[PDB]
């Protein structure tokens, strides 16, 4: 009988190859052509924390399972109804599979912040205004980071923290996590292929967290004499030369109006778009803010509401790599437990 | 052969009790007379995220392990000499037993900083500055918020953040994670039970990362009316019968002086004191900063430089609960893997 597992990112390789490795057969159901999740699809280029480059650290974790006779891997596909009791699951996908089950580990993940929903900080308008995603892209592909008005290297680039988060105003009111992090992360990558490029980072709070602080936050400045300030943005504009970063020096209101040859936006980590989707056919209940709810951690590790289902990953909520691969072998380890 | 499992805080009860659910014996070996951890022997009370007791949480996880007769406890114990290999280990006790084991997880957590170390912010020189630890228990104990000085309800409370973290001069880089949202928490307990209380806390950032922002940060602001103010503090006197904190108010450079009744310290997490000692007899590299050393976690999740030996929880770094019980039920997983 084999464990149903959903979404073929960092958090389901992790739960199919732990099972695998202790014998028990899994369904790996992902809905896009490739496995890999975010850091595959998105491009992403050095991780925090071990500097390794995405397509290798998390192209092995791909590897590693697309040949285990034990995962059974289902790629352009999705569950389309889910029924049953713990050891007693009937899974039926997209393509008309039906799959008898033992329980199943949601493992969907999150949607990238669209940067078009914080319109007063120019996404859409300039085509100098970039996500963080598009900036790991020009480093993994090996373009460079350039600018897209005229492909020129960009001699000042500013990096806006929180878009998509901390916003009450835009109904979202969490903290991604991990953006502070990989901002310091790409501003260090931005130094290192131009070396005549002045980064700043505009902040509210610094997040770098736990190793991140020595690892990212202090190198960030005395190696690559990275600048953050921290200040409320009003908005970006043009004018018609350069990209304007307009705002409040510290929290108060002290003007500042500065010119940048790229603006990038540290987008959050929104809810899956699918979360609604996969609520009712899996019949999990939602977090107040659109996550997959989990149980608390206490109890039965990786617990959703509903028995024989669990949940891992940035499914839960804006959540690290690391933390991800964790969750996803302890809700394997509760999958397990079923068999008693 | 059974898995042996190093100290019984969080994560230890949470390997055993996942192991155990699996059919896979274990020997939980703790240092202490009684197992649960920092949580249980320093008194915590509510716990984040949850809001749950600490004595409620993680009892309940020390009592479904302490009749489980596939978990075999030993108390007021240490690992004495580690020797073999994977599937072949043996391990003595202090009390002269003698342990055949398959692999080792260590769950051995860390020490709480002690701010002796940090003499220019009052600990030791007067009684009413206290350690967030010291808080948890005035709540847990039920006996409530109270000067040391004369017992008296403190009007005036002022938390001071990243006391024995962020802090190159005494060898403390890192950022212990949890204190900003652990004393955000805090900050509510003392106001929902002194509502004449007035809490204030001095930062550098604050870090409620996550579903921690709006449940901890904005809550205590919004419902509670806890004030956050971004300073450097210099020093914390007395003029006699109040305790005076003294720093530059970061935003607009100008120093302050403002009177409290007590000051608590947000007490960082430093390495366990005794990693030396489990390097030197488990032959596990440490990380710089004196934490177990654990591998990168795309290729096997929990792996020290070891084979046959895992890691998880604060042993590895500043970490929370949640986070230390997915480590924890993850290591068990890749233990289980040795089995082949
Ligand atoms: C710019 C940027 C850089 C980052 N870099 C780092 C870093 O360096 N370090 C770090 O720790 N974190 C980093 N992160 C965070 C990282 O993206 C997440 O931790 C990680 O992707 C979470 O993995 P996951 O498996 O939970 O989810 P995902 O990566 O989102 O994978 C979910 C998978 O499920 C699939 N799926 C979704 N819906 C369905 C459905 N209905 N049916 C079936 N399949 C479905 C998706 O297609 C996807 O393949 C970064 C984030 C950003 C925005
Ligand atoms: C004031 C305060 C409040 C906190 N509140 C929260 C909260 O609300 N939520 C949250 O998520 N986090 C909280 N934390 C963090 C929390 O303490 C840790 O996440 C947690 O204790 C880590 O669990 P652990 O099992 O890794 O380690 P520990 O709790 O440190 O347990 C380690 C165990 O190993 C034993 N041990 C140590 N050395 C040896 C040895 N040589 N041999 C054998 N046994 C040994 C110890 O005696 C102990 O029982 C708080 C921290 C502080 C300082
Ligand atoms: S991790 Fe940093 S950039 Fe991301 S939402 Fe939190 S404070 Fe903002
Ligand atoms: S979590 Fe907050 S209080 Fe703790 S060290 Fe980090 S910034 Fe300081």
Redesign the interface.
Same mark, same amino acid.
């Given at each position: 009988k084999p464990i149903l597992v959903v979404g073929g990112g960092?958090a389901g390789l992790?739960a199919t190859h732990?099972l695998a490795?202790?014998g028990q057969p899994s369904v790996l159901v992902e809905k896009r052509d490739r496995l890999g999740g975010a850091p595959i699809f998105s491009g992403y280029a050095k991780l925090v924390p071990?500097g +390794?480059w995405a397509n290798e $650290?998390?192209g092995?974790?791909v590897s590693r399972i697309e040949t285990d006779s034990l995962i059974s891997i289902k790629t352009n596909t999705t569950v389309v109804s889910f029924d049953g009791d713990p050891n007693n699951f009937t899974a039926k996908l997209s393509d008309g599979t039906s799959i008898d089950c033992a329980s199943a580990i949601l493992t969907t993940g999150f949607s990238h912040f669209d940067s078009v929903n914080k319109p007063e900080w120019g996404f859409g308008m300039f085509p100098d205004v970039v996500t963080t995603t598009q900036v790991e892209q020009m480093i993994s592909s090996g373009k460079g980071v350039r600018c897209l008005s005229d492909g020129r290297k960009p001699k000042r680039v500013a990096i806006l923290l929180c878009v998509g988060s901390?916003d +009450?105003q835009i109904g979202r &009111?969490?903290?991604?996590?991990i953006c502070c992090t990989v901002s310091a992360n790409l501003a260090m990558e931005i130094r290192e292929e131009l070396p005549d490029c002045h980064v700043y980072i505009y902040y509210m709070?610094? +997040?770098?967290? @736990?190793?991140? &602080? =020595?690892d990212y936050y202090?190198r960030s400045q005395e190696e690559f004499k990275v600048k953050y300030i921290?200040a409320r943005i009003a908005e970006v504009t043009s004018d018609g030369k350069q990209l304007i970063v307009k705002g409040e020096d510290?929290?108060?209101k002290r003007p500042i109006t500065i010119p940048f040859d790229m603006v990038v936006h540290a987008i959050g980590m929104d809810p899956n778009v699918d979360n609604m989707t996969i609520s009712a056919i899996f019949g999990v209940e939602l977090?107040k803010?659109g996550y997959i709810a989990r149980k608390?951690?206490?109890?039965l %590790? @990786?617990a959703t509401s509903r028995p024989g289902v669990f949940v891992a990953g940035s499914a839960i @909520?804006? &959540?690290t790599?690391?933390?991800s691969? /964790?969750? /996803?072998? $302890?809700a /394997? %380890? =509760?999958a397990?437990?079923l @068999? +008693?």
């Open positions: 960092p992790a732990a490795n202790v071990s +390794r $650290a998390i092995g974790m901390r +009450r &009111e969490w903290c991604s996590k709070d610094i +997040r770098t967290f @736990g190793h991140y &602080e =020595s202090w921290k510290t929290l108060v977090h803010h608390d951690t206490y109890g %590790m @990786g @909520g804006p &959540e790599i690391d933390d691969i /964790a969750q /996803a072998n $302890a /394997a %380890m =509760s397990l437990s @068999g +008693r």
